[PDB]
Amino acid sequence: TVLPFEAMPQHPGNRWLRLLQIWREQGYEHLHLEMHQTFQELGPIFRYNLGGPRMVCVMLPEDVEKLQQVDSLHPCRMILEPWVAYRQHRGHKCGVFLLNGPEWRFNRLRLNPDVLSPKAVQRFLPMVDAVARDFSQALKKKVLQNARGSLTLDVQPSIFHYTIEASNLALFGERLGLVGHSPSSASLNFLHALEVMFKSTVQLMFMPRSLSRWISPKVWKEHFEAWDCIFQYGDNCIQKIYQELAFNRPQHYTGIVAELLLKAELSLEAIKANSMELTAGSVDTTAFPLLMTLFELARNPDVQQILRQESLAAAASISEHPQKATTELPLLRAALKETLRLYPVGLFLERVVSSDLVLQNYHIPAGTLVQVFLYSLGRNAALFPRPERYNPQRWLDNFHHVPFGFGMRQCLGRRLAEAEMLLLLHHVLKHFLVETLTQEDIKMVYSFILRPGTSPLLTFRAINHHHHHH
Amino acid sequence: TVLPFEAMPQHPGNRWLRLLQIWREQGYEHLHLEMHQTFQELGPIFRYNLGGPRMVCVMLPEDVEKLQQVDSLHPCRMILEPWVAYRQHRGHKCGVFLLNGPEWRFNRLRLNPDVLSPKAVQRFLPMVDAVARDFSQALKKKVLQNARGSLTLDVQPSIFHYTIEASNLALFGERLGLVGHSPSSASLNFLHALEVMFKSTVQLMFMPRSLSRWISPKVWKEHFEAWDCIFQYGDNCIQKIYQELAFNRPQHYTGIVAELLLKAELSLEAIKANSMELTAGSVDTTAFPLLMTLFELARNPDVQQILRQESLAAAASISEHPQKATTELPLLRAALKETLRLYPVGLFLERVVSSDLVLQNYHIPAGTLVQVFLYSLGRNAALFPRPERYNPQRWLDIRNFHHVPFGFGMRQCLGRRLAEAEMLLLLHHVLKHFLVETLTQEDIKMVYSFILRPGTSPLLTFRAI
Numbered sequence: 001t002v003l004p005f006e007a008m009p010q011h012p013g014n015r016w017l018r019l020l021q022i023w024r025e026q027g028y029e030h031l032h033l034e035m036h037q038t039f040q041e042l043g044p045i046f047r048y049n050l051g052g053p054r055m056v057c058v059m060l061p062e063d064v065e066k067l068q069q070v071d072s073l074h075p076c077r078m079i080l081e082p083w084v085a086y087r088q089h090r091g092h093k094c095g096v097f098l099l100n101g102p103e104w105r106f107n108r109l110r111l112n113p114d115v116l117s118p119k120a121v122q123r124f125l126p127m128v129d130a131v132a133r134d135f136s137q138a139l140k141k142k143v144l145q146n147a148r149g150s151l152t153l154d155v156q157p158s159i160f161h162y163t164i165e166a167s168n169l170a171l172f173g174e175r176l177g178l179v180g181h182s183p184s185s186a187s188l189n190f191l192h193a194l195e196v197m198f199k200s201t202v203q204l205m206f207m208p209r210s211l212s213r214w215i216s217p218k219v220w221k222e223h224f225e226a227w228d229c230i231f232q233y234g235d236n237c238i239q240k241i242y243q244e245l246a247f248n249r250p251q252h253y254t255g256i257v258a259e260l261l262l263k264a265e266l267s268l269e270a271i272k273a274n275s276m277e278l279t280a281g282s283v284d285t286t287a288f289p290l291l292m293t294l295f296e297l298a299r300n301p302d303v304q305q306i307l308r309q310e311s312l313a314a315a316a317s318i319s320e321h322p323q324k325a326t327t328e329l330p331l332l333r334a335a336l337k338e339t340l341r342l343y344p345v346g347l348f349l350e351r352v353v354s355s356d357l358v359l360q361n362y363h364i365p366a367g368t369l370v371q372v373f374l375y376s377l378g379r380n381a382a383l384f385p386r387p388e389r390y391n392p393q394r395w396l397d398n399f400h401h402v403p404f405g406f407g408m409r410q411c412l413g414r415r416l417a418e419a420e421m422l423l424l425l426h427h428v429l430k431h432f433l434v435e436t437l438t439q440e441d442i443k444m445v446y447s448f449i450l451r452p453g454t455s456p457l458l459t460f461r462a463i464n465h466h467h468h469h470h
Numbered sequence: 471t472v473l474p475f476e477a478m479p480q481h482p483g484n485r486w487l488r489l490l491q492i493w494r495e496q497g498y499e500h501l502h503l504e505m506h507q508t509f510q511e512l513g514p515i516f517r518y519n520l521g522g523p524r525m526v527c528v529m530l531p532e533d534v535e536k537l538q539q540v541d542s543l544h545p546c547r548m549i550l551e552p553w554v555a556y557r558q559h560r561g562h563k564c565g566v567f568l569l570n571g572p573e574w575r576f577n578r579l580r581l582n583p584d585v586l587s588p589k590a591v592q593r594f595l596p597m598v599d600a601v602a603r604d605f606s607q608a609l610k611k612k613v614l615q616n617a618r619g620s621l622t623l624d625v626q627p628s629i630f631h632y633t634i635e636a637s638n639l640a641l642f643g644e645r646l647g648l649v650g651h652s653p654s655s656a657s658l659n660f661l662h663a664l665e666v667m668f669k670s671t672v673q674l675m676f677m678p679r680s681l682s683r684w685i686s687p688k689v690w691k692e693h694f695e696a697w698d699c700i701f702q703y704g705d706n707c708i709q710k711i712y713q714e715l716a717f718n719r720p721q722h723y724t725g726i727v728a729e730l731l732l733k734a735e736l737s738l739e740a741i742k743a744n745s746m747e748l749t750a751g752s753v754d755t756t757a758f759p760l761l762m763t764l765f766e767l768a769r770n771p772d773v774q775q776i777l778r779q780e781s782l783a784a785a786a787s788i789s790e791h792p793q794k795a796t797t798e799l800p801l802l803r804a805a806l807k808e809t810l811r812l813y814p815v816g817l818f819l820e821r822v823v824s825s826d827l828v829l830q831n832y833h834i835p836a837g838t839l840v841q842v843f844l845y846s847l848g849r850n851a852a853l854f855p856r857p858e859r860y861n862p863q864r865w866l867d868i869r870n871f872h873h874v875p876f877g878f879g880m881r882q883c884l885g886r887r888l889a890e891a892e893m894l895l896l897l898h899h900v901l902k903h904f905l906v907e908t909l910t911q912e913d914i915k916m917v918y919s920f921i922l923r924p925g926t927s928p929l930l931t932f933r934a935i
């Protein structure tokens with residue numbers, strides 16, 4: 001006795017009122033708070049009167065599980081129009097982020113061994129580790145200059161450059177000295193273009209191209225300029241590795257995009273496509289969780305001390321083999337789960353479902369956009385007693401951690417992001433105390449990704465008073 | 471056995487695509503055509519989705535009849551928000567065109583006697599007649615200066631200036647010097663302001679102020695600025711007459727607005743709002759049909775003769791007694807009806823219906839906005855056999871509800887008789903002196919900017935007979 005779809009509670013909003021609001025305010029920064037309010041009012045599930053087709057909103061781990069079982073051989077998420085529009089506009093391919101069906105599987109099966117797999121991690125992680133080391137050392141050099149052995153800064157810029165750097169090293173095998181040196185104009189341009197892309201994504205996202213073409217011509221013009229810039233940044237990288245490997249096939253490991261070029265299992269343009277997604281994808285999605293993690297430790301000193309204690313003890317064996325940072329810092333790994341529980345950069349998981357299923361005892365038809373809202377999911381008091389508490393212990397005691405998604409589609413950059421975040425935190429922790437007066441909740445803001453709206457003024461205080469030694 | 475509301479056919483599109491359409495287009499110039507191929511395609515009645523509120527579009531006399539039968543004691547047209555908002559902005563009252571309820575009735579009842587009465591019509595018809603005599607007289611001077619004894623021009627300018635001159639005389643007893651001379655900057659400003667006011671109205675009309683406010687704030691600047699020019703024109707007129715009456719009450723007839731001022735049944739403020747409506751309302755609505763009529767006569771020389779023959783035959787007693795023109799030119803009175811059938815100035819009739827009723831075996835809830843759509847109505851080839859035929863004879867036996875281009879009930883156009891007199895009188899004098907021709911045989915594209923209007927001025931030749 002399952003309830004018919006038509007009998008599911010309904011988000012009260014006109015698709016058109018949202019759209020005009022996006023037109024007026026040039027964005028939709030509270031999306032997540034609204035959604036959250038909506039589950040709060042209506043409960044675990046609801047449907048949204050969309051532009052015609054059925055779409056449903058869920059927030060329970062149970063629902064993710066079922067969603068995973070219904071994953072075909074080709075799971076589907078929605079065609080993000082403005083992004084694809086650009087690719088077809090310049091005649092490019094699309095990486096796994098923008099693909100569906102046979103083309104997606106083909107690519108993903110050829111990217112898993114070299115981006116995601118555990119044998120890939122083990123080659124690229126010591127490279128990340130070196131970048132992570134330079135971050136702290138450089139931050140320590142600046143810290144010890146100060147009479148008080150501390151520095152108080154907005155760490156956002158430098159975190160964003162750490163991830164431009166750690167990533168570009170792992171990906172391409174070049175250091176672009178953006179750690180312990182000022183931003184370049186090339187890196188500042190890139191960052192800005194990525195911001196413009198997301199903002200202009202949100203403006204064009206909520207309406208068909210046929211209509212947005214004539215009511216927002218210059219949003220489109222903005223979006224393509226931003227991409228043109230993101231693409232110039234990423235094609236410059238491609239050109240350099242590509243010419244280099246034309247003349248010398250290395251004996252040793254020189255990064256992820258080198259494996260893909262060597263192994264030649266993918267066409268040049270298919271590699272170009274997937275390189276871009278990795279260069280663009282590796283920056284913001286990693287930086288905000290680091291930032292938010294830095295904030296949570298800063299304002300939970302007792303948890304900070306615990307994570308340090310663990311990192312101080314594993315110090316010696318991690319500088320011996322940096323690869324042991326995965327298995328030896330499980331509290332730190334847990335802290336990340338916790339940061340992403342509260343601050344889920346990917347706001348929601350998306351499936352355009354290909355077979356009737358049952359969620360929450362309602363019946364879901366073939367082609368329903370099911371959408372899993374990870375903000376409300378993370379804050380469910382029933383599943384996460386005291387959700388407002390940052391308590392990484394919570395995780396040590398299943399589908400509760402799913403911020404990278406699930407199944408075969410699960411984030412290709414998961415382990416790179418994980419390594420990058422984990423390793424930076426490890427070195428910061430053994431070297432510095434992290435502090436703030438700014439102990440009130442940071443207001444998160446939606447522009448395609450869920451990001452902090454402000455940056456807290458953080459303090460890094462040296463524990464030792466030495467440049468190398470913790 | 472009565473089908474309930476939502477059983478009715480549904481206009482394809484939505485208010486939102488409409489808004490945005492209008493935003494980018496800056497207009498809705500095809501509304502009449504768009505509504506027409508909706509009647510063609512869906513039937514003689516349909517609903518339009520306002521997402522909650524209730525609208526019905528109808529095209530048949532049969533239905534108009536029932537609409538009237540359900541006029542209240544206070545028949546309602548909808549609040550025309552932009553126009554009313556201007557009255558709020560500047561602190562003036564509303565006239566009869568924008569009122570509803572007891573305030574409407576109180577105004578209208580004190581308005582008909584001097585604006586619409588047959589008795590009124592006798593007092594001002596000879597004034598109108600003077601101006602239309604000056605029109606042909608002037609046209610004739612120019613025509614005879616030419617070797618072929620004819621002049622080919624675009625008359626739209628001089629026609630508009632005619633209706634300004636004739637309204638001003640009828641309304642204020644004042645005679646501007648516009649007929650047979652040059653447009654003054656005031657009149658030109660005035661015609662511009664009016665046409666911008668219509669333009670801007672369409673741009674704000676189809677969305678609530680809560681949207682137009684931020685979507686189209688320049689269009690609001692544009693709308694009010696147009697009205698400021700319109701209120702400057704009429705208030706100048708009011709001011710003049712107010713002063714002359716404070717000083718001397720005349721023993722004789724000197725205009726419509728004088729009779730209102732001398733009676734003082736209505737308040738000064740109320741007299742002002744109505745006088746303004748009559749001044750703005752007596753220009754584009756009269757002038758466009760009068761042009762369309764000239765075009766159709768040029769297009770149908772054999773209808774032009776019949777009419778010319780009637781006017782020459784009635785010339786003498788009309789010259790001697792102007793007032794008789796209402797009764798001695800029945801074919802010319804029919805031609806007006808004919809023009810208004812094919813070219814209805816006010817595109818739709820309108821009632822926010824007070825009681826329940828049934829139209830076309832559909833149930834229509836109280837509070838519903840029922841619109842009659844006259845362009846379709848008059849083009850109903852099943853009701854007017856050979857509908858694109860200009861045939862004045864069509865109207866020689868009057869049933870009534872085939873001719874509703876001024877509306878119906880207590881609400882029917884207050885300016886109706888002044889309108890008909892002006893158009894009647896001009897054509898009469900033009901017919902006795904000139905033949906009217908064009909090579910332009912092809913239909914003229916109507917355009918919708920709040921009123922339905924030609925989008926082109928056909929080039930006309932006038933030849934002295």
Ligand code: HEM
Nearest residue numbers: 096097281282285346403404405406409410411412413417
């Ligand atoms: C903590 C940071 C990150 C989070 C929270 C995250 C999360 C996600 C999520 C939720 C999805 C959708 C998964 C699904 O539909 O099952 C996804 C897809 C994807 N992400 Fe990430 N990601 C992160 C970092 C990265 C990085 C650094 C990269 C690139 C180096 C990356 C590249 C991708 C790609 C290529 C896809 C498409 C995968 C596919 O469709 O197979 N992500 N990610």
Ligand code: HEM
Nearest residue numbers: 567748751752755816875876877878881882883884885889
């Ligand atoms: C060919 C000439 C005209 C046409 C086709 C026309 C059309 C109309 C229509 C269709 C209505 C609506 C009545 C209703 O909804 O029941 C109306 C009302 C009105 N008209 Fe005209 N009109 C014309 C000339 C004029 C003139 C010259 C004036 C000014 C002297 C004028 C002033 C008004 C006013 C004040 C109303 C409001 C009546 C009320 O609600 O009581 N009209 N007209």
Ligand SMILES: N#Cc1ccc([C@H]2CCCc3cncn32)cc1
Nearest residue numbers: 097276277280281285346411449
């Ligand atoms: N091209 C491209 C591209 C740019 C940014 C991303 C980021 C931002 C969107 C959500 C997400 C999950 N994993 C990575 N990402 C992903 C792809």
Ligand SMILES: N#Cc1ccc([C@H]2CCCc3cncn32)cc1
Nearest residue numbers: 567746747750751755816883921
């Ligand atoms: N104020 C004013 C005002 C200005 C123009 C008009 C015109 C044009 C709109 C429909 C109509 C019916 N009778 C006259 N009119 C009516 C009122």
